[model samples]
Target: KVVPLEKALEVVQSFKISPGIEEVPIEKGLGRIAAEDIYSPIDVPPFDRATVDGYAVRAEDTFMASEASPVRLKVIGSVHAGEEPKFKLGKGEAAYISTGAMLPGNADAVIQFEDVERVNGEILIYKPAYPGLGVMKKGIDIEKGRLLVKKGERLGFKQTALLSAVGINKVKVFRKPKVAVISTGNEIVPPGNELKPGQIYDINGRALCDAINELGGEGIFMGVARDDKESLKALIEKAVNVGDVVVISGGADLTASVIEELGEVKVHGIAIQPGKPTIIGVIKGKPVFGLPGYPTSCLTNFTLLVVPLLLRALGREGKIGKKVARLKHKVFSVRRQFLPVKLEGDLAVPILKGSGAVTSFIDADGFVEIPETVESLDEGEEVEVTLFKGW
Candidate 1:
């Protein structure tokens, strides 16, 4: 039975589930949501630092010391980049300091290394020191009590590096969503087996698993179940027990096995096209779904129904990851259809060329959401498309 798109969306969102969180190391924290806000323990620099390698001296001492009539100051000590500054700068003395070295006590400015010439135990000053010159103030990059990362933010490469700056090794993050996926078709064959007539490899299982991993959750492979009432019911019961969500590909709708299942089917269809036959249910107090078995149909339905349910369970706003882009052409008006489309430049290209076409999504850069308001897109028409994950 074909269901309206809005009805399917409503059914998919009907269930309310909440998943808990767990902490992971920084190495595994990327792509995980932060559970709490993190703060810096101390100032980033901790101390005033020299922005250049030169002489550290009091501004008053070198105010009149320039190249034309140079004043030679006695060199007291040398400070390398990582080493501590040994001597204090008195009225007429200077210390050789390297870049990033801590500012010497009582020193207010630095003179560039190039302008000075060291002769014997003294150095010639070519320019006068200006107040607050060549010194990067402490805590300029970050300050104490400053908010480093907010709650619920996804940690990525730059985020980890920033967290590292504040000496954070492990972050408290929300646990990954756990999804159990199953393929239900007698015609399905595992990859590497030679394909006989009327048989196709179990691409739905692998594709759905990869999608769960790609989207907001992690997939637990439940293998394939036969198209029989007893085995299908037993599989659904098992999946609901172990997974936060259960997904069954194929054998839905008026199919002999799904019709004979032992539990109430909570959701049957959506008004949307291509994926109208999606089956949603609650079995053993958990969410179970019977999506289309065809590879394209299965993938499309995941974006339409499954991904949103899992994302909401993880304490996030349920959202189909999409972006606003100018549609390349004018899509003609027709009954609202949920089209799984790929993007070709500014163009919204349809991915449901045929259920068996493997390259439909492969050759395309990203998927778009086409509203049921339009029947077809015309060449050079401007429109907005909802992008899939990683788009």
Candidate 2:
């Protein structure tokens, strides 16, 4: 039965595959998804510190100080960064504090050295030192118990920095989903092998694996499965055992049948151009997809169907980046179409090559979707092109 694209997506979405979690060092957490909400373990800064090379004094002591009539205060001692203050401030007393130095007890502010005149054992304040002036208070940058990163958030450099700032050496992140990739057909041969009569180098195996890796999933190539039912079934069984998801390219009907014998084929076909002969199935609780033999069709279905499932399993948003560009020429399609496009300036020039041609996608930056309801897109019409990668 041919299913609509929406129905196919709905079927694929029904399979719940929760990725495993593992604790990794913050250094290795980049590009990984956080499995748990991380809160600040301690307040950032941890203690009140000076923001400038200046004297730490009680704010009230310098309230009346000015350039014309300076307030004279005794210089008790000096404090540099990394050294704990040994003296506390008293009335008419101040301590020379360097930048990032912890403020002495009873000191509420710091006056820049340029704003104070030092002579003998005393410093004359030239400006009123308000509370917190030139002082970075404890927990100012990040407060304790605040959410640093939410669960399911992708950790980037900024997130890692925040985690490191709070002294968090390790973080719990979702394990990269393992996708078992299998390429079918007797004519298909692995790359690096010489192509014999009627044999072609397997494209989907490498392409799909690389695409999976790009999405933060680990693609396990299960090697090429021959046309025979026994070999295909054995590979499918093995894939289900080891992978969080299974993706097989070519022989849609045959692949669906094997999946049916093992589990269930939820979807047999989709009402979409280039990728109509797609299969959505499940075996032993692992989602399995049978993409078309053609490279473009296989990848298009993979992007449309498999990507969302993988992203969900990884606890990430399923949305791909897109851009709006005006169509350079008119195009029409009977079924819902994902037309490969190359962008020139702000124009989306459709790559009107057959889906079987692998070079079509190589030359294309992304694709523009033309719904079945809309027969054609006129020249200069704005269209949203879903990018294969970020712009």
Candidate 3:
């Protein structure tokens, strides 16, 4: 029985394909999802420091200081980053401090060098420097024992830097899901080989592999399987042995019972054009997907279903970046379909190439879903478009 697009998506996302966890250095953790909440062991900055390159002095010393009646304090010593202060900042004393240098004791504010003129062994502060002004207090940026990074957070460059700032050299991250891609059809040939009559290059396998890695999963190519039933089942078995998810393309006639004999097929078909024959199942608790062979169909089903499944397996809540754009022309669909489009100015220019036309995807900037119940969209209607992560 065919299920609605949302029902199919919900069923696939409910699968519990939990991936294992591992520890990696912070540098290597970029793009990986954190498996657990990480707490700060120490404060960021660790101690109070100067946020400016100027002088650290008592705020009261410079309270009445002005351009006409400037306050001058003895420059006891200079402080640079990573150096410990050798003298305390007394009432009438100031220390020449560089950015990020630890503030000396008794100093509550910093005056910019531009505001004060350095004359011999003293500094002339012509403006008032309030207490705590230009000074980053200890534990303010990140406090010890505070939650720094939440579980399932996708780490980026800034997140890694935050972890490093909190003294985390290594982090526990979910192991990336391993996806094995297999293309099944008698007409399929390896991409590099010249196409003979009735034989086409195996685009699905390579495309699926790229999609898997693009979703932060490791992709393993299990090679193309011939149309013969025995070879198809054998290839499926091999894929199951190595990957957390076994993705098979171009296998429409392969029934649920065929998969059940070896594993299980929980979902049969979805109510979506160009991708109606999609299948989602589990073999030994691992995810298995059967997608259409057509280039557009295969990639469409993979993006809508497998992308989320892979991300969930990798400890991330799958989400797609989207934007609202106006449709440039009228479009119609009987079932929910991802209509590929190119953005020109504020309009989504439809790419109406057939499912077998691979160039459609190449020319697409993103895709917009035409809901099954809605049947058609008029030009100038605002529609949400799912954007590609990058071109």
Candidate 4:
């Protein structure tokens, strides 16, 4: 039943599935994948606006104005942002204007207030005016029907804000993948429940759910299942109907048998250490994963197998940050090892004390994968480390 690491990877990838689409408000689209392309409804800065508070006038009329021979013009009225212009500029005429106000008819340029002096009924321009000076033209920033956001892009802070600026209130986004997380075994108990002797808190269920959510999937913990076959079978049957993926974090052999009875186990075991009992299968047209009971094994398999599937379904690329670093000491691996390590200054110290070590991943920054063919690695050997999500 044991399969090579490459085979396990291939099997997991073959089960990728896409979810349905749902309409969400642009503000609530954060972290959700956009399902459709969004186009701008109107031109940004829909009209000509004054770049500064100044006097709107015909550029040609100010040509003769200078410090010694200032040209005087009659100030008809004032125009502020959001108000329609009440008067048009003609020869020997001007209008008081504020920043961002729409340009009045026949006005080709704006003169800063500092460049002109206001008298009883006239303003004297002491500087020359150039065509389109201090004026923002229509559609300069963005034109109508411009592509604001493309499909498959995550609506993060910048993307969502951009869509809102273009008058978009709502958008269609891909639905989050729904996962039914089930932790099996008689010794497992919920976090808040009192644990009997030899009972441990159900770490795998919660950890798997958190990982699912992090990958943009909705994880529904369907509670723990005992070692009994019928109880486990009932959970899987219900899970497949309710979720796109089913994850069981224990009883590899028992789950594998149930998988055969209900559906089929594509790959029974993985060659990787701590995660050797990993199971991948399809039941009722839905993917099911049998993860190891150990916390580290459960997390390692889920991250490697389930994360990519969920990410692909949500229209995201499968990727993790990677970097090269030096190993702290000589290390050896007989199996394809996912050695968790805490990063120091340019050093990756391996934390493979045991498969059940919960603190290993918590204290480590990432994992260094060593192939089974490699016998050992030197202390100063340069190796690639697949980083944690936020690292």
Best-fitting candidate, measured by TM-score? 2
**Model 1 ranges off by over 4 Å:** 1-4, 7-19, 64-72, 117-120, 124-126, 145-154, 192-197, 251-265, 312-335, 351-376
Per-residue alpha-carbon lDDT of candidate 2 for residues 1-391, written as tens digits (9 for 90 to 100): 8989999988877888777899999999998889889999998789999999989999999889878899999999888879888779999999999999999989999999888888999999877888999999999988999999988788999999989988999999988899999999999989999989999888889988988887788999999999889999999999988899999998426777888899998998788887787888888788999988877667777888999888888777566778999998998777787888888889998886654367875767788888877677889879998877642
Give TM per candidate. Answer: 0.82, 0.94, 0.85, 0.90
State the displacement of the C-alpha of residue 17, model 3, in Å, after optimal TM-score superposition. Answer: 1.7
Report the CA-based lDDT of candidate 1 relative to the real structure.
0.72
User: Which residue pairs clash in candidate 4?
Assistant: none
Model 4 ranges off by over 4 Å: 143-147, 354-356
Weakest 10 consecutive residues of candidate 3 by summed lDDT: 251-260
- Cα-based RMSD of candidate 2: 1.9
lDDT of 1 by residue, 211-240 (tens): 788655778878777776666767766777
Least lDDT summed over 10 consecutive residues: which range in candidate 1? 251-260
Candidate 3 regions exceeding 4 Å error are 37-41, 51-55, 60-78, 89-96, 111-130, 139-150, 353-356
User: lDDT per prediction?
Assistant: 0.72, 0.87, 0.83, 0.83
List model 4 lDDT by residue over 151-217, tens digit each: 7778899998998888788889989889999999988888999978999888778877887787678
The worst-scoring run of ten residues by lDDT in candidate 2 lies at 352-361
